[PDB]
Subunit: 474 residues, 4 copies
């Protein structure tokens, strides 16, 4: 029975470089708004190219070949990750309050899902730190070769406003596990949760310069990370046309390793043989989750002709009963959207689909004054060539499409540019295997929908050393 | 459209040690029988303690630090294996013939199944040779520790008569892959296909003393290996009673590494939702394949009450039409059993099932004089406590058991001592996953009937170095 | 500057089954001896066959398919291991005091060496719990195979008195990491450290029956674990002549998986180019550590003819300055031996070498009454054929041997039967690399003194599914 | 005692697409020169955007879900690679000769060094084909998650003239092992060895469109690949500034996965305790191997002050006796350089080094009229700031520098941009392990220089599939 901490103070507003709280070099300060009311919560220092340069120097130094962070036993790098989890657990009440206040997401969801995840992953990568193994290879001739997994160096990290803390956790944890020093840039709307983490990082005992958090805008602070000559690696996560400018700015600078976690459609495929009670509810929480604005989920839903009639009826009854309101209110399932820019971008696409063919089953407009609330929207009779089908909506809007054969859904769901996640609902083995295997998706869910070892391969680099031996034996 | 080689000659009948063909120290010679007629095929040299002693010395020398086989590149070890597959591929006709003539298994099945598995295995492990990797561990303090995966040494191997050539492959390939030297003992009844591999091993250009093949009996040849003080490792496969005698005789000698591969019942589970036409056929092939005498097979088939009536009625029609006769004859599905000992042991168990309540649907008796043929047998209304249910029959006899709930079969199929393989037939995801996860078995097949293989043939040697200063 | 807890009373002296403190079924209670003074510390419940049976049934239940220990997320098995480490860290002073009083080992070594290891391993295996991965294999035909790494079941564990708590930690941690239930048997002389862990186990929040501790003798409680039909695996550590009886008892029982961790010599090799200051100190601590009685270390040390003269001089001065006395006294380097049985067995072998050829440089006799104290001993001019060289001494006695060439040591050090640990001291790359590779050993240390461990505590399960059409 | 095939017939000169020899779409034909004499060997069909378009369509068809190459067993992909190695082995004489005649490499070196590498690589990846394993993860909750390793798709590969046939094998083999399809572009100066491989690809019985070979120029054929909207992945190896244009043009088209393999300096470090006879020989064959023009090689050598006098005196005697001449002649150690463009670029850098202080011990000038022979060159008393030290000379020019302490060389050798390969010569363990660990390189050789699993990680993409189960047990 946990509840949000009243009179929440935003104590940490300064830039975190080299374990020190510093002001901005220009002196400029940007505003952070509560999306639930529109009201300004506080002000945060605005980092720029000058601020990045200080943060890279701090991270580069913290990484040199005599550093506290390099002399450290790998097992202890996990220990500082494990103690970080303790602090996130201790301050579970207040971090979720920030994530509910700043992000907009309901409080109970921030406590039971988001932070649970945040805590889980830190403990996970704490376990990995002293288990990243290389190999010994029996190459030809009188030689003996082996490999070390070693840290890349200074890692630029840019995240969005979707899951400010989870994105922070999913990017910080793997990097430190492998022995890197991090220069991170949280979203211009949601830097608060990332900023509080700075206090826990200092408290957990992370060597100075290891993690530098720089709040600010994208084309300013973020583009400075992408074009920085002293950064070894960038890891971006967000939108496609911003992602295209990242790899471009990297190739002209110092050819830093680029990793992108871009958006893209995510089709749910629901067959007739699946149980209706579970299939409807899991697909409803797979579109509307976190107000609908997440790259991990997908609004696109393909339903079989036989159960299409019943599916719509079940869906509309979940939308007419979904509680939408205050993020601090324990009854609310849905919160507000992030931006005025976002609020308007969704309505544009809703009113696109209205005049384009699809049937407005429920909702459509905004809920009312203050915040960026949109009443739950469900569309029926959606086709592939519609604007709502190609460009995915990033809000509380779900599309219900009709399908006949198994070969039909495969080619219709696969029709997407780089980036796909799949979700099948079946009790037929042969159907599930066929669909999951033919999906051109990174991740395929079967009878579920909610969002490892390969994760840390992008945060360490191979180093193959070979030695001449006097005589080789097997 | 392949066919057996007419007027086959068994050219290789001597002991294979150090790439030479040697006569037995005693001079004694044992017979090898054609299980389809009872006729004597040929006479093979009989290995004993003396003969095993010479074989170990050949393998110990081939494993020494200066040796060609140790100095050799890992990639070359796989090269030789790949050449061995080549030679088998070329002689696929005659090897299948030997396997058929000696082992009873019908020719086409030994060609397209057994030898396909032989060729593929050598090909597979040929690829593993230079890809056995150790690791580098980041251990606390100013240290750097790495592991080498190194061959154990002389590996003693004893196989049954189930799949004479396949069992030979499955044992030789991984051991040679890791760079060991072998002393192998093929079952007394079926040594022929193993001894031909002797020739191809020399022809492929394997260093002398790497593979030593010794035909002979169990308590003479086999037990000499298990008790031998100069053998580093033993890998046995066969009956449980003999397996218990392996580990006991190994512990009282040098404490050599033991890998047993014993029998054990294998339950086929068939739910109502699965397709009948496929289920009946694959479960039929799950019991009757290779004359029923295989450790990998499972005689007991559980069928959901709903389809039980139809399943038995289908299962009889596949046994009434099952062509049983000459292995060389291209039409025959079922060859003869291996032994008089086996032929009698099966018949005994059938008349147990008859006089204990189970319904003899078809078969039950032997076919005719000469050979060891048993006509296909289906038992209906079989319960768990019956003699035929507990001890698994090693022949062409299938049991069909009634089951009600899912919770029932899981407990009932779990109720075995140590040997388990599973087989489920379902179209339900939740049913197939919840059964496969709950089933206490080594392998579980769903709607049908590697790397971890070579872990038993190499030993880890972890080396740690003291470094001046540690950096990540 | 940590101190032993003054009036340490043994609170936990009962048998730990199913998270409850139960008495002995027989009612008999055995005494525990302080090796520092010879006094009786306390009395502990003597477990027997009937005590084993209850513990097995308790561990079997906590492992059944519906159990809380089986439904538990693997990451949360890591959570209970990591929480256990906390409790050891919190009671670090208390548990080190028990290990010093009962084991005999100096308190500071118990706090900084023994218990640090204990904590570190519980933190290391906590991390592995949800990282034990199987694999997906692209096999031929329209199929899809994957492997599951699953717990074995009930695991019997028997450890010596060498590092009572470390041995407990090194055996408990991996087993639980893989989801097993453990029945462990600590040494008759050192059960106290193990039983206190029982209190930390229940406090940590381990499900009832998951870990069962049983204190007592060898042929009683130990053999009963070995010959138990309900135990799926045994893991023994100790002497070689008891390990031989373990495999035999297992093979005549239920053929449970056997893992033996037996003794065997551990040669140090010291070349002329090595740093004399570092080499003398590390080889001295490579014999005398934990009063000499450790299977992980080794008494025999080969020194090159060039530096042989100086080595003896440096070696005798480190023994003449080594303070021996009370384990609670912070100044003491060496404690007493464990037993009257041990004390006598060491002196027997000392005076053996005196009359056999080796020169008594120092030590030789005991220190006196109360406790089993032996003064540090060094023997010069030792050959391979001596009784002290073959049968390794398990006490505070080091041999110093002479070697001429490189090919000499490798043959002389290799000459051992099953069980070796090497240690090289060199600043020549080609010398170190050729010595460490040619050494027939399980572990080799260069200029000093994991993942593969948890494989013996899990079993592979391959599941293969038939698919409509296979694509790469 | 092997020999080159006299009166060599260059039979294969056309474009290779769908196992069919096609003339160029434009019709144009470009010349291929013998670098030993300057004389024109033959005329090859000139590929361009039009030519590439067809090749991609062939590759895409060979990759579709129905295709033979897709339905094929993993082991049968290994079978084809092994048969290709068989055929290379049979044709070892002509493939070496083609390499020797076209690339300028001395025949006996090309037979025993290069083609041993070509054969051994096809053999090696044949073995990997059916051993690309995924995982099964024990993820929290009632779920079962497994991963597949699946092929990416159509792979675009561009290679240089350094090792025309080794580079071919090194790109083809891993990509084919993982089940991809290939569009490969050999260097304009050495396409012959790669084109001949076309015939052997068809002969081995590779499905049509699995390997499409296109000989041609960079800006035409090469750049058509990096821009194509239907190529999933690109692997480039060559010069840095061409690589900078690859990652950029890939990010402007379809965000295809980019793997670069650029050059860069490679420092040899020789300590006093090392054996002079072996060290001088291996460091000499380090620089001068394959006419000094290989990214794997390293021109700059640091020699300890104590032995510096002897090392020069030893190196000057090894260069004076180094027989340079005709590649077909068995005696010759060194062939000609590949280009007039390359020949000129090396000479420029030499007289740069002469005019900058360094001591010209031997060589400097070219050898004669016809071909592009430069006589073995040794520079003495070189410093870090010099033009020859920063930019690596891609020819037969070695540089010998002096150093005082271990700390000095580690800093001096680490001072490089991106690419690095190290080679230490010592008999001291503490010296070797300190340097090998501290060196900011990818590969480090100890006491040698010379000619795995991590190779195929770049040619397949992970696919996680998670299943919801009724109840989870251990
Ligand atoms: O979803 P969404 O609309 O936030 O997508 P988005 O790409 O705007 O969000 C992802 C992140 O990229 C950053 N970003 C924006 N423009 C950038 C640029 N030119 N260079 C570097 N980083 C930039 C933003 O700060 C944001 O946090
Ligand atoms: O009859 P089956 O083949 O079905 O099973 P089995 O276990 O009797 O035979 C399997 C193999 O073990 C060998 N063997 C038999 N007795 C042995 C003994 N005492 N010691 C060592 N090896 C022995 C046999 O020669 C045969 O090759
Ligand atoms: O050290 P060490 O020399 O004491 O080694 P050891 O083998 O004599 O004793 C180590 C452990 O083995 C146990 N043990 C002794 N006899 C046994 C038997 N017959 N069966 C099973 N376990 C037995 C003991 O209880 C002790 O805990």
């Amino acid at each position: 029975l946990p509840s949000p901490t009243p009179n929440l103070e935003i104590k940490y507003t300064k830039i975190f470089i080299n374990n020190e709280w510093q002001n901005s070099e220009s002196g400029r300060v940007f505003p952070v708004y509560n999306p639930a009311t529109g009201e300004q919560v506080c002000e945060v220092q605005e980092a720029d190219k000058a601020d990045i340069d200080k943060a890279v120097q701090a991270a580069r130094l913290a990484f040199s070949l005599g550093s506290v962070w390099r002399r450290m036993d790998a097992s202890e790098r996990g220990r500082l990750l494990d103690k970080l989890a303790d602090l996130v657990e201790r301050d579970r009440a207040v971090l979720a309050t920030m994530e509910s206040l700043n992000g907009g997401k309901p409080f109970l969801q921030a406590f039971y899902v988001d932070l649970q995840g945040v805590i889980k992953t830190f403990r996970y990568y704490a376990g990995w730190a002293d288990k990243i193994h290389g190999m010994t290879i029996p190459v030809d001739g009188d030689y003996f070769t082996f490999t070390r997994h070693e840290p890349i160096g200074v890692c630029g990290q840019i995240i969005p406003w979707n899951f400010p803390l989870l994105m922070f956790a999913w990017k910080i944890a793997p990097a430190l596990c492998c022995g890197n020093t991090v220069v991170i840039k949280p979203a211009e709307q949601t830097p608060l949760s990332a900023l509080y983490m700075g206090a826990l990082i200092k408290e957990a005992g992370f060597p100075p310069g290891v993690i530098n958090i720089l709040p600010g805008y994208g084309p300013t602070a973020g583009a400075a990370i992408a074009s920085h000559i002293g950064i070894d690696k960038i890891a971006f996560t967000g939108s496609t046309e911003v992602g295209k400018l990242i790899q471009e700015a990297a190739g002209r600078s110092n050819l830093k390793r680029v990793t992108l976690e871009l958006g893209g459609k995510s089709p749910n495929i629901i067959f007739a043989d699946a149980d209706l009670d579970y299939a409807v509810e899991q697909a409803h929480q797979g579109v509307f989750f976190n107000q609908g604005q997440c790259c991990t989920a997908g609004s696109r839903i393909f339903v079989e002709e036989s159960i299409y009639e019943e599916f719509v009826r079940r869906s509309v009854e979940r939308a007419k009963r979904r509680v939408v309101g205050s993020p601090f209110d324990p009854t609310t399932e849905q919160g507000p959207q992030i931006d005025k820019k976002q609020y308007n971008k969704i309505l544009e696409l809703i009113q696109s689909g209205v005049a384009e063919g699809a049937k407005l089953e429920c909702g459509g407009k905004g809920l009312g004054r203050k915040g960026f609330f949109i009443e739950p929207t469900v569309f029926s009779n959606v086709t592939d060539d519609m604007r709502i089908a190609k460009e995915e909506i990033f809000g509380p809007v779900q599309e219900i499409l009709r399908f006949k054969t198994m070969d039909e859904v495969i080619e219709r769901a696969n029709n997407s540019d780089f980036g796909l996640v799949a979700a099948v609902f079946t009790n037929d083995i042969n159907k599930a295997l066929t669909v999951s295997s033919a999906m051109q998706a990174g991740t395929v869910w079967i009878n579920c929908y909610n969002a490892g070892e390969f994760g840390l391969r992008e945060y360490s680099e191979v180093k193959t050393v070979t030695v001449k031996i006097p005589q080789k034996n097997s």
